[PDB]
């Protein structure tokens, strides 16, 4: 066995089409279901509809609602526990309401003979004029004593005579006819000694603190069902975590024995088609802000570095079927796009507007929208551009034009008759297929300094850079590759415009030297790149401030030191072994050592002489 899990429902009193339709989807949701992650809602079910699939239901996480049913029996015969992680209304984790119709018929049999715990929340019973036996149920065994005060029990039978509880039953309390429907008391029937549940009336049959409905024995693994989490039928306070502080390594480390959390369960791998959040919980799919990927046959959400990948149809396809260009109407549909599947056309019509297709002039400002675009699958076509804009500013993050589709079967990048001065395409590192044509841009400089053949993937691709401002003129006006650029060319005047630096680079920018020995963030170099020193190394006066990335490669620790790592503070209340939280103090040399195991709340010195009371 490995319990079947269904989603649950939260439609409350809403009715999904015909009674007929409603039941079909109820059945569809719960058929075979053992554990309900969400709520169980049984609603609008009529006379003579077989509801027997409900016999499979062992556990509900949310609430249980049973309302507006005329069906005779609701055989929730194995429901052991309602956690009440959500409430129906106010604060009821179980609500059984107006189960009757105008036709003088309603619900008779709700035999929940195995319902032993409601973990949180109260219960409402009202307007069930055909209900039997339940009114005899002694709720103090089922409901936590904090919720007794919000209990709403109104039992009134006016539609039948009922069967009677077996004399076998305790205090005449039962769920329906027969010995098998007697309440099984597991709380109110037990000696002082026991904290929680029980299975006998003696001192030596208390249930472990950890159990919910009752138990089959003393030990933590004999529970019927778990108050908090279960981990292969051992009830625990929490799922064993993914990271533990490593006393040897002096930091967080993969806890080998660690486990993800799924429902009220601790599990080594999420069920098929589930993703693990950055907190160790199995969820159905990743939050925006983050994305799906994989390390060790485990799908996880990592958080997006910059805008999340988003794919959009180009002009021509989809929302943009029959569109001549990006334009006032359509441009909004581009917000946040990262990759364009298809082509972009920016044409004069965009800026005049077009009374024929009912489109107003495009606010050129709005082209800022394209800044998120990193990939064009087809071709980029720019035949118009705001004249007071110096370069192709909206495409500063374009990394690749794949040129799968091409204008007239030819061009993958076409820039024609603009007022620009530089291309500005500083991120473009690949044009997969197609030809470049840059023509009639009378102020355009820089274009020739690029070796276009390096962006190309196919050896037949051609360039045509014609009738722009001449090499001669640009040179004569200083509009030429910055000093800090290698002989590999420009996309414009600025140092972040170069294809590659003659010396070193920060991020995208070219520089003459890194900040070794002087500077705001002190740095080291690798592959002509200036990488920052970890923020916990002290800026040194005389020599370098670090040799690499870690908190291990400081010359000198800015604050405290923990093994080989410099840290901002000593570890204080990090989760450790055996579920022993971990506390360190900083000595004279500002070096971290363990506190006395006994200092529940951290310490300032060694031993009990370090955490006064």
């Amino acid at each position, epitope marked *: 066995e490995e319990k079947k899990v269904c989603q649950g429902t939260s439609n409350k009193l809403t009715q999904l089409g015909t009674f007929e339709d409603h039941f079909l989807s109820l059945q569809r949701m719960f058929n075979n279901c053992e554990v309900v992650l969400g709520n169980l809602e049984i609603t609008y079910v009529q006379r003579n509809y077989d509801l027997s699939f409900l016999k499979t239901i062992q556990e509900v996480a949310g609430y249980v609602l049973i309302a507006l049913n005329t069906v005779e029996r609701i055989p929730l015969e194995n429901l052991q526990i309602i956690r009440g992680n959500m409430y129906y209304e106010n604060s009821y984790a179980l609500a059984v309401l107006s189960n009757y119709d105008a036709n003088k018929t309603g619900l008779k049999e709700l035999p929940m003979r195995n319902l032993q715990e409601i973990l949180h929340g109260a219960v409402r019973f009202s307007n069930n004029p055909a209900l039997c036996n339940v009114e005899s149920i002694q709720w103090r065994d089922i409901v936590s004593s904090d919720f007794l005060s919000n209990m709403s029990m109104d039992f009134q039978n006016h539609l039948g005579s009922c069967q009677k509880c077996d004399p076998s039953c305790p205090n005449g309390s039962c769920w329906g006819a027969g010995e098998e429907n007697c309440q099984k008391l597991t709380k109110i029937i037990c000696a002082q000694q026991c904290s929680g549940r029980c299975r006998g009336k003696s001192p030596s049959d208390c249930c472990h603190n950890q159990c919910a409905a009752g138990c089959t024995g003393p030990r933590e693994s004999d529970c019927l069902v778990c108050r908090k989490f279960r981990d292969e039928a051992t009830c625990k306070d929490t799922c064993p975590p993914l990271m533990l502080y490593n006393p040897t390594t002096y930091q967080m480390d993969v806890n080998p024995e660690g486990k993800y959390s799924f429902g009220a369960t601790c599990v080594k791998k999420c069920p098929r088609n589930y993703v693990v959040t950055d907190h160790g919980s199995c969820v159905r799919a990743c939050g925006a802000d983050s994305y799906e990927m994989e390390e060790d046959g485990v799908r996880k959400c990592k958080k997006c570095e910059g805008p999340c990948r988003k794919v959009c149809n180009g002009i021509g396809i989809g929302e943009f079927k029959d569109s001549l260009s990006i334009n006032a109407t359509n441009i909004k549909h581009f917000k946040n796009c990262t990759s364009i599947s298809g082509d972009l056309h920016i*044409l*004069p*019509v965009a800026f*005049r507007g077009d009374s024929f297709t009912h489109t107003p002039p495009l606010d050129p400002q709005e082209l800022d929208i394209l800044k998120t675009v990193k990939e064009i699958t087809g071709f980029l076509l720019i*035949q*118009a551009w705001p004249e007071n804009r110096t370069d192709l500013h909206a495409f500063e993050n374009l990394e690749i034009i794949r040129g799968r589709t091409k*204008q*007239h079967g*030819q*061009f993958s990048l*076409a820039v*024609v*008759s603009l007022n620009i001065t530089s291309l500005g395409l500083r991120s473009l590192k690949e044009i997969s297929d197609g030809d470049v*044509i840059i*023509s*009639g*841009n*009378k102020n355009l400089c820089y274009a020739n300094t690029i070796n276009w053949k390096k962006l190309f993937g196919t050896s037949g691709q051609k360039t*045509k850079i*014609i*009738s*722009n*401002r*001449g*090499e*001669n*003129k640009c040179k004569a006006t200083g509009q030429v590759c910055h000093a800090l650029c290698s002989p590999e060319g420009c996309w414009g005047p600025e140092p972040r415009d170069c294809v590659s630096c003659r010396n070193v680079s920060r991020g995208r920018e070219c520089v003459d030297k890194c900040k070794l020995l002087e500077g705001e963030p002190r740095e080291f170099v690798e592959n002509s790149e200036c990488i920052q020193c970890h923020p916990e190394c002290l800026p040194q006066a005389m020599n370098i401030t670090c040799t690499g990335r870690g908190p291990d490669n400081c010359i000198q620790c800015a604050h405290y030191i923990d093994g080989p790592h410099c840290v901002k503070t000593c570890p204080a209340g990090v989760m450790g072994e055996n579920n022993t939280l971990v506390w360190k103090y900083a000595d004279a040399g500002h070096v971290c050592h363990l506190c006395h195991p006994n200092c529940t709340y951290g310490c300032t010195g060694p031993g009990l002489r370090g955490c006064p009371t």
Partner: antibody
Framework: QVQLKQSGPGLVQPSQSLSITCTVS????????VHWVRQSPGKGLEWLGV???????DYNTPFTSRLSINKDNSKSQVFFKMNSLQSNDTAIYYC?????????????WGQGTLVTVSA | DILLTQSPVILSVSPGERVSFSCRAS??????IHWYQQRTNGSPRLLIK???ESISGIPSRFSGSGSGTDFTLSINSVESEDIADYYC?????????FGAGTKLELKR
């Protein structure tokens, strides 16, 4: 068969305007710009401007302030207008279309209009 | 501004000889040069694009060569309908620009 054909009254009074129509066939103005080039004995062949396929124009510096080129794609017609002519402006005026999108290798030319600027 | 200087003003050749026309750009310009033929009363006619690239419809006895500042249109066995003006054009600097023309004349 790419063809360009010009019509337009060619004798023009000084300060009056010159208008020439260029009716085009065998390709659409949807896909190709039409250029305008003039020729005289004295100062040679000279490029005047373009209405590019998308409808935007571009004029050589000396005609910036007085050239006007328009088009009607559906009738495949281009309309050159130039204001305030003087005798500098006597020439044979031509429309042209490049062999190749966005280029200036002019494979096709109207028959030219002989324009004479006198009062 | 880019200057295009064609020379000679009149080229005088015997019919059948290999004749060559020269165009000199004042700034080095790759291969961004085209050539036209213009017959009396005719509109110009494209012969070579990008310095050396044949144009279809043009007889094979027309070739072109050059790169930078120095370009050359050539005719092997000059015919009598090769009597025309020949022009070069540049493609590199806004605006396109033409040379002044060489007149081809047949000796006799």
């Amino acid at each position: 068969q790419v063809q360009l054909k010009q019509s337009g009254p060619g004798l023009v009074q000084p300060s009056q305007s010159l208008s020439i129509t260029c009716t085009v066939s065998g390709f659409s103005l949807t896909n190709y710009g039409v250029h305008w080039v003039r020729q005289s004995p004295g100062k040679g062949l000279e490029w005047l401007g373009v209405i590019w396929s998308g409808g935007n124009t571009d004029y050589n510096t000396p005609f910036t302030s007085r050239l006007s080129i328009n088009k009607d794609n559906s009738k495949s017609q281009v309309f050159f207008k130039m204001n305030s002519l003087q005798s500098n402006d006597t020439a044979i005026y031509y429309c042209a279309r490049a062999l190749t999108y966005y280029d200036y290798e002019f494979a096709y030319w109207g028959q030219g209009t002989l324009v004479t600027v006198s009062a | 501004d880019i200057l295009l200087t064609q020379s000679p003003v009149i080229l005088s050749v015997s019919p059948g000889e290999r004749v060559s026309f020269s165009c000199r750009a004042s700034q080095s310009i790759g291969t961004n040069i085209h050539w036209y033929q213009q017959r009396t009363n005719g509109s110009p006619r494209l012969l070579i694009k990008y310095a050396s690239e044949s144009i279809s419809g043009i007889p094979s006895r027309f070739s072109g060569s050059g790169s930078g500042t120095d370009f050359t249109l050539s005719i092997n066995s000059v015919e009598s309908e090769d009597i025309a003006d020949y022009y070069c054009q540049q493609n590199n600097n806004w605006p396109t620009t033409f040379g002044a023309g060489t007149k081809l004349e047949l000796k006799r």
